[PDB]
Write a protein that binds this ligand. Structure first.
Ligand code: HEC
Ligand code: ZN
Ligand code: ZN
Length: 82
């Protein structure tokens, strides 16, 4: 599956929109923040799979039910969002 397909088949939409702020940052805003940051795809892939907190606010993103390979597809897709 591609990034947009995984975005809908995994639980992401409970907390994220592509364009609007929900629980987590809008995915276009993640793309904007990490544009030009060397290494961002691997960083986001680990965060999508394993969870993270404190990059955008106090609310954490729990770990997600994704494989490495799904997390990498999703991270590359998120970074592509313009
Ligand atoms: C609520 C329970 C969430 C679900 C389900 C998913 N995400 Fe999330 N995400 C959420 C929050 C609250 C945050 C911000 C955390 C913080 O650091 O303040 C995030 C963050 C992201 C990011 C950005 C990470 C970064 O390093 O800046 C991405 C790319 C992201 N989330 C993607 C993502 C995907 C692909 C999900 C489905 C697999 C997903 N999230 C689930 C909240 C929640
Ligand atoms: Zn597609
Ligand atoms: Zn899967």
């Amino acid at each position: 599956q591609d990034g947009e397909a995984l975005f809908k088949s995994k639980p992401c939409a409970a907390c994220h929109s592509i364009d609007a702020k929900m629980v987590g940052p809008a995915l276009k805003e993640v793309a904007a923040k990490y544009a030009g940051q060397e290494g961002a795809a691997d960083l986001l892939a680990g965060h999508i799979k394993n969870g993270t907190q404190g990059n955008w606010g106090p609310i954490p993103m729990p770990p997600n039910p994704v494989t490495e390979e799904e997390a990498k597809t999703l991270a590359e897709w998120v970074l592509s969002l313009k």
